[PDB]
A paper describes a structure:
Here, we report the crystal structure of a full-length [name]_4 enzyme from [name] (BlCel5B) that exhibits two AMs (Ig-like module and CBM46) appended to the CD. The BlCel5B structure comprises three distinct domains: an N-terminal CD (residues 18 to 330), an Ig-like module (residues 335 to 428) and a family 46 CBM (residues 432 to 533). Full-length BlCel5B is active on both cellulosic and hemicellulosic substrates and auxiliary modules are crucial for its activity. We find that the large-scale conformational adjustments of the distal CBM46 mediated by the Ig-like hinge domain are crucial in active-site assembly for optimal substrate binding and hydrolysis.
BlCel5B crystals in the substrate-free form and complexed with cellopentaose (C5) were obtained and diffracted to 1.7 Å and 1.75 Å resolutions, respectively. The substrate-free and complexed structures exhibited no substantial conformational differences (with the exception of the substrate). Because of minor variations in the loops located distal to the substrate-binding site, a root mean squared deviation (rmsd) of 0.33 Å between the complexed and substrate-free structures was observed. A single protein chain occupies the asymmetric unit, and most of the residues were built, with the exception of the first 17 residues and those in the loop between L398 and P405 due to weak electron density. Similarly to other members of the [name] family, the CD of BlCel5B has a typical TIM barrel fold with eight inner β-strands and eight outer α helices that are interconnected by loops and three short α helices. Very short linkers, D429-D430-P431 and V331-P332-N333-A334, connect the CBM46 to the Ig-like module and the Ig-like module to the CD, respectively. Both Ig-like module and CBM46 have a β-sandwich fold composed of two β-sheets of four and three antiparallel β-strands interconnected by loops and a short α helix between strands β3 and β4. In contrast, the CBM46 has three tryptophan residues, two of which face the CD substrate binding site, indicating that it may be actively engaged in the carbohydrate binding. The CD binding site of BlCel5B is open and relatively flat and is thus barely able to properly hold the substrate in position for catalysis without assistance from the CBM46. We found that the SAXS envelope can be well represented by considering the superimposition of three different representative molecular conformations of BlCel5B: a closed or CBM46/CD-occluded conformation extracted from the simulations with a relative weight of 26%, a semi-open conformation represented by the crystal structure corresponding to 40%, and an extended conformation based on simulations that is responsible for 34% of the SAXS envelope.
Numbering used by the authors: 20 to 399, 404 to 532
Amino acid sequence: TPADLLENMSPGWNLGNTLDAVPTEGSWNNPPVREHTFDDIRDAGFKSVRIPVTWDSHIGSAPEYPIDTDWMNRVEEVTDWALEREFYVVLNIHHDSWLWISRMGNSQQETLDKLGKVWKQIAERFKNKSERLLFEIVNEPTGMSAYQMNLLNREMLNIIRSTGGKNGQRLVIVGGLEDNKDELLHSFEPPDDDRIVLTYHYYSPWDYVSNWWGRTTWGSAAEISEMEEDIKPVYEKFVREGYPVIIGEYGTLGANEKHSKWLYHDTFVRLAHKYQMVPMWWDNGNDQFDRAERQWRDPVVKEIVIQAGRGVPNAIIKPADLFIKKGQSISDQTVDIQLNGNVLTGIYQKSEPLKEGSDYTVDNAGKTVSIKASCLAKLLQPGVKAQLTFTFHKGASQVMDIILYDDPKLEKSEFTISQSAISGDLKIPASLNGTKLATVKGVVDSTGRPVLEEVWSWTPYLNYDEDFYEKDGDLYLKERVLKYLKSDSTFTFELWPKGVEAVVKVKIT
């Protein structure tokens, strides 16, 4: 049942940008995966792992398309490591989707024949593995009609089932075009098979999860309702008619603001759990778990996923970052808690409890905390001076950073660039003094229009990572942005806390 799949697999995590890298494992930002990484993911409490695999460069010539023996052995080695740790494991065909499977539209007979020969080999090799191994037919398929998609699912499923044995009953994961929710609802037709699982990916709102166009925060009543409105119809059409469902990918993709990130993950994973959908977290190796340091970049959001993935609601504090300016008058500070049914059990500085009464008070409802000013003053150069851990009877703890900040200071605020010597990003050395980068906008000085008008006409706000970023306290404008510059322009780096900014002028010769 869908309930069974949820109990057994929720929550999951993706081994992203690894076996799916191009041309081979280790070609991108992760080295080839080490066995102990699976021990670390198990320590975290994930019940399942998705192992995206890109087969492309390891597939031999027509007509038999033999998969390189060393590659097949490697994929089995990693898959076995995961299975030995009692994970439910999803094995797929990944970036092949746009590398060659998208030739389906223009050359179906040849492409479908090739994919069939590939799936037959994968199915044969993994035929005798535990039922904890699931096959996913193809990641985010594109370049074909909805009819072709349905045909592809049917034909590949038939190939897997025809190998017999344990593959006769193995769960197989199928979706619509682009693993898209709307396609699943409207153009997808379930194969006639009672051992399939449906899938879609979820990354909405795209501009929030990616921090595009200044969308730095998430969590309005409208946004929460829209998220449930995206998910509920898949439950109504499919889950309550008995189809298990896996959300093969979800998560933030560069969004950094802490409260919103925590709220987004708690809300989504709780909705997934509510509607009996298995949520599998996307992590490209730089997003969440640091495999080299063997620690999570944001431990709190991980604990939120682990608890919400088990149907345990998490309490959410606001603010998550408490900004106090150097020199400012220190008053009692209010912390609101969205309890989500939980009860606050204490507030700690590491292992040392704060004293209720003198350090802080709580209202009768237990959801509004006042941190007394003398306590704050004791807790406090700019930077993180303290971390307060809010513990709850159930669910993840919330950690609030106490940050002393001051006005950000730029060594240089005006830069000259020529249109013919542009090569690499523009570095803007800064002393951010405890502040954090939120977003950036760029305006052409003479016209008042967006610097990137040629691509995004409606806004001057830029996109995280592809246009701007912060690194080691310095600010950067990407080469992409510089190439669109025609005359003198002004960039406004908006920081946390809100209202703090740094203005940089760029002169064009």
